[PDB]
Symmetry: D2
């Protein structure tokens, strides 16, 4: 289960670089130089890294400090063969964004958040990123009167439309991926799920430029089925990026390593990505727990990739097993994939087998055989 470049495993600088500050605790690790993280990730077999503007260039840097930070980072990339497939903006840490970036009630802040984004889009393109993620973690409210959501959606649409006009005007080959989250750090976050983000995108001026960046734990924070949401994003053609991690249920976002948290959901996720031929990076947005020293940071990162590869092997064995293929037919998964009424409306209307002569009790007596199928899946997952 050793990673390869074709596995396309990628990590955010802020993942392994998380110093361990939480709502109730100070940092437990020193800050990492991005150069060190690139080298250590490469050694573990990662293919690339990602960044927020502020992870790579300290907020408020002069042009000369900006250039030096980028130069050093690029040297580490060149030294290792690491790629930068995705970048994003920090529109959440600085106090100025306490009510939002794109949907701050203050218009001056909205305009600033756009200009900060556009600056980093240019950098992302310089570094070869083809995806630009937007996580509006400050967009939302703790109280009902604070945020008129229709007006906030109008501002959010205006912001993303301006970004689309910008990339089009520059001739860039970069696309956007909107990352939903239901809550945390705001009491409620706007576009709280994959579904709300997909629906929003369809209202944009240039919807082809935007997809989703779903994150395992984010959908699980609302108790939703992550594989199901990924399926709807694939069905819509909008899975432009994915963030992989673990989460134990409906609680604060834990950002556990991938494979931890809901292991069976991880299995069905990998099965779906691999069956569908998803071609994007397998990006980990996780935090090594603050209990760990740097050895444990690198162990946790390695574990992300390892668990993906173990699950990949088990899912492939499941799908290739003739006994599972038989059980899939026994449960009529083949029939689910066939059109209900390719004969057309009128033919359906005229078909007595669909109504007057449909034997409902005979149909109801048929078992689905789902339990035997699921125990085959369990046996395969556990290597039993």
């Amino acid at each position: 289960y050793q990673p390869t470049p074709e596995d396309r495993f990628t990590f955010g600088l802020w993942t392994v670089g998380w110093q361990g500050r939480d709502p109730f605790g100070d940092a437990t690790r020193r800050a990492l130089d991005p150069v060190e993280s690139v080298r250590r990730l490469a050694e573990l077999g990662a293919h690339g890294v990602t960044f927020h503007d502020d992870d790579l260039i300290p907020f408020g840097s002069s042009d000369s400090e900006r250039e030096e930070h980028v130069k050093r980072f690029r040297q580490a990339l060149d030294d290792t063969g690491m790629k930068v497939p995705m970048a994003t903006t920090n529109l959440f840490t600085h106090p100025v964004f306490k009510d939002g970036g794109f949907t701050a009630n203050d218009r001056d802040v909205r305009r600033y958040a756009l200009r900060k984004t556009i600056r980093n889009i240019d950098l992302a393109v310089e570094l070869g990123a083809e995806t630009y993620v937007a996580w509006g973690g400050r967009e939302g409210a703790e109280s009902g009167g604070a945020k008129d959501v229709r007006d906030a959606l109008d501002r959010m649409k205006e912001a993303f439309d301006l970004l689309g006009e910008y990339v089009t005007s520059q001739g860039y080959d970069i696309r956007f991926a909107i990352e939903p989250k239901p809550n945390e750090p705001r009491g409620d976050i706007l576009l709280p799920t994959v579904g709300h983000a997909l629906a929003f995108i369809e209202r944009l001026e240039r919807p082809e430029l935007y997809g989703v960046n779903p994150e395992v734990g984010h959908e699980q924070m609302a108790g939703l089925n992550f594989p199901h949401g990924i399926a709807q994003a694939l069905w819509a053609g909008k899975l432009f990026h994915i963030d992989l991690n673990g989460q134990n249920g409906i609680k604060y976002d834990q950002d556990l390593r991938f494979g931890a948290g809901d292991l069976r959901a991880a299995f069905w996720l990998v099965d779906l990505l691999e069956s569908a031929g998803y071609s994007g990076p397998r990006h980990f947005d996780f935090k090594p727990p603050r209990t760990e020293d740097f050895d444990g940071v690198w162990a946790s990162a390695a574990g992300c990739m390892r668990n993906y590869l173990i699950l990949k092997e088990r899912a492939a064995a499941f799908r290739a097993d003739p006994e599972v293929q038989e059980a899939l037919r026994a449960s009529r998964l083949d029939e689910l994939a066939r059109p209900t009424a390719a004969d057309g409306l009128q033919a359906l209307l005229d078909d007595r087998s669909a109504f007057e002569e449909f034997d409902v009790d005979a149909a109801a007596a048929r078992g689905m055989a789902f339990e035997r199928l699921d125990q085959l899946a369990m046996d395969h997952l556990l290597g039993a």
Copy 2:
């Protein structure tokens, strides 16, 4: 707080008619004749009722039994002045639908579910309904291998497209409203939230024919903010119906009377519907607890309407209060409603006030004043 016809309060037959069977208990009340429910609802000041096919006509009825059931119901409507604004299909109770209607793995069941729906669309139109709700409560799975979600979405789209072709072919003035729910009775339900349903609709052949029917408790079963989801549905132009009830958090769907459960969310909901000028029925999809006799059924139904009207009064007083209007300005709600960059992209790019000369620390020092605004809202809700 006495209801009027213009309040347009409506109830499902299955609400006040719920006999009290639950996962662990037998019925505690006798079945109600729909005629009795129409009369009792009218006496309380309801404006209309709604129905599933099977609530009005016992499943498996002959044509003559069907006609008699409808005739009696229509007499009660005529006797009372009650309307029937919405109808829906039962595609969940009968064992034949144990794996779904429109997305059953068995194709024969899918075709039958369409024919059952189309039959009741014709009835709905005969009774003057302008909305047809679809709640796919059996669409989904308990296990991962049981349901390929992309194939199920293809079947779901095919079904709704056929229904759209049917209504168009008949020249009917009826539109569809898809009701999301995240889980229960399936482990996970397809289209689990307002967002997923909105996104799905945009993929239909005739998207103008479909909206959402959000239900208070359903979105709260995923821990989501119901007012926020209603706002996104209004923003999209897709709020075709609403189902009102109460829910205490993330648990089994409780179907409490409206106002019970999350009272502050109920307040912000009413504020939003009334401010936005929502024109549809205020429909209650609730269950009087099985602890109650029929006196308690009618009390619970009356309480639905009463709580809506109390909340309406308090929300209107909030919005009309000059002190609240001042607090809204103090929190910059007026600025949220103004375009970020009506000057355009290039002007924003050229505006040093948005970047080089934006004083981030001065902007960050500004309080939002959200707590004072929310305590005004609390004072108004409580009549303090």
Copy 3:
């Protein structure tokens, strides 16, 4: 992974006998004769069955019907070698219990619930049960004014004290196990978690006669860590019974087969029961999904046992692995098991190494090595 009598796997009659009625659906399977269930369970390698009074004897049976039902059941037990280690009362299905049994507001109902219980305690003893479970599924409320909880706890204590006096008066060797659940079918259930039940027991007149019967899914309905709660019950000496099943998070109680739901929690549960030498039955309180026919019922039941045995093997391999034993020492699990201050209070107070000369920064620099330990656990679970 084939079950043996020493595995002591047991099943409730109402598990495999669940006909499939849910909040939104009719039965999908015919009722099973208890005799058939005993025979089929035995064939799968179960060691015993359990029952509610009403599962074995139809409610309202004459004395002669009661005797015949028991006679047939006993013949099936004798024919198979199956045991009956536990019994319980149905104080939830009949409408009379809609506000509770032991804590019904009506005193007449409370007295009846005690008499119904005592009758079945005598039967349980006749059948050789050594544990008597009490699940107060109707004890609680949907609204705040309905149930004064201090008065209800007084009634609950009075009821359990009377049962204790009864068993003591008869000289029976049976003990009670109180089964917590947080909600469903009441909005909130009294004694909602293992902790609340443990605390309650300590207030009883004869606390040695009562323990807990924790159920996997019940604690997971409150988002709690089931292994942790089992650990506290073991620490208290109060784990008198356990109910095994699966649950996917905070939602309606799903009663999935054991191993489904939170698989990693299942692994840590089995590890804990086996490490602690738990000696009671491994009882499954689950429902084969209503999608299944009887073949799927028996498959689901077999899967319960299979998953327990796979997990047992993997947990034992984890604990026996010298690399894991080393990692446990590296994470200081050995030190957690050593007294903080066996030297005593005054010695601790006088120990400068505990205060003035404790190097907090050196201590804080030490990693816990928990991630490497957990990835060993993951590798073992998956057989990697």
Copy 4:
């Protein structure tokens, strides 16, 4: 609704002093001098303040710095008439406590956490505190192998027993209050609910010295009914302190002002505390949102008290209303308070009215009238 000294409203220094750092954001407010907070709280009508050691004396202070900090604080208390009824230890912020204080796997850390606690117990007594809270926010785990919970409970018991021996040895009139929380900042926290804490206390050497400090939002993080848990703590005689705030469901702990979050639960809480004659401080453990400036901090704190007093008035009006008193009798709340079987076991056994001659169908036909009672409660809460 203006606060008075007899209202006994108290606040933690860390509440109004929270600078606004969260998992994704820097501070938005400057640090407050404790002196300023005492004066501002007093002006709003608070009666007292509380503290962690580290809120009053910067961690690592010399003896002279410690004395000066305490002297200034005491002057502010004397200047205002503010009391200090409760104190507590910070055993969570410093990296040394990343795996716990009392249950850290490292024994040296456990001993240090005891010595840090004991130092501040002496200070608490000097300042006149009669309650000493313990919130073990770092006690727990993210992974299953990291923490043997039985061993951790042994260490937790050892620690609390040593603290009990210490206070007894000094002749102090201070008692302990253990504050449960289910998760955050650990993945799972030990003693996660009121129930688990109550049960734990009964195992201590001197259980009379310990009670619980339940917090509204903490129990609501597990989806539990806070009023119900407070009722069980009162029933046990163990409500030694309470922490008041708001929470919107099962999510990260929000620490909203009291009255926000679940307003109806707040109403039933106040009703219960006032009806039971709870005599302790009404302590607010909340955080003014980081959106606010200092004006909003003081507004949020004022709102805590205001909402308590509005709710107190409405609950008292509910209980005094003859119509509610009649509805309580109609729902048999009076009968819930009467013993089930003061006649004794044998009399119950011999009572045919409890069994052979109990008319179950007549009893089941009786409505509980809970909906009318709850709508009276709603009407009273809203002043309708």
